[PDB]
Amino acid sequence: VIRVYIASSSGSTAIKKKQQDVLGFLEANKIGFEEKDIAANEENRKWMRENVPENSRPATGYPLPPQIFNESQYRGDYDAFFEARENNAVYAFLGLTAPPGSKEAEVQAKQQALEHHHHHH
């Protein structure tokens, strides 16, 4: 399942909206997910902060929610999610197989078919 770490009592309206954006997208696309609130749960808060890789931790304070993981594996922050959706490559971003019928899956299918034909003699 995709774990989305959020802060329900974030001091920023922008953060609240970014979290709802991610949660709503997962729901809409029927992607199995669960929210992990760090606002009032020390385990969730500490876990998120430690499991966000160094290269995704801002130079100021702590990494900001939402932070997205596939089970315990880090996938990315809101910016990474935002870009993945702009490129219609959200499933790859989440470390999930793009569903048969989805544009992402078709695009992936065509790309692999081409790379195979080039490899093929």
Which word captures the global form? Answer: elongated
SSE arrangement, N to C: EHEHEEHHH
Annotation, overall tally of beta strands: 4
Structural class: alpha+beta
Highest CATH level, the class:
Alpha Beta
What's the assembly state of these chains?
monomer
Q: N-to-C terminal Cα separation, in Å?
A: 41 Å
Strand order of the largest sheet: 2-1-3-4
CATH architecture label: 3-Layer(aba) Sandwich
User: What profile does the largest beta sheet have?
Assistant: 4 strands, mixed
Specify the CATH homologous superfamily: Glutaredoxin
The total tally of domains equals 1
Radius of gyration: 16 Å
Strand content: 15-25%
CATH topology: Glutaredoxin
Organism: Homo sapiens (Human)
Family: Belongs to the SH3BGR family.
Keywords: Cell membrane, Cytoplasm, Membrane, SH3-binding
Region (Required for interaction with HER2): 12-49
SSE order and pairing:
Elements: E1 2-6, H1 13-28, E2 33-37, H2 42-51, E3 67-70, E4 73-77, H3 78-86, H4 90-94, H5 103-119
Parallel strand pairs: 1-2
Antiparallel strand pairs: 1-3, 3-4
Describe, in plain words, how this protein is organized in 3D.
It is a single chain. The chain is built from 5 helices and 4 strands; from the N terminus they run E-H-E-H-E-E-H-H-H. The chain has a 4-stranded mixed β-sheet, sandwiched between helices. With 121 residues, the protein is an alpha+beta fold. The protein starts with a strand and ends with a helix. Keywords: Cell membrane, Cytoplasm, Membrane, SH3-binding. One of its GO terms (biological process) is positive regulation of cytoplasmic translational initiation.
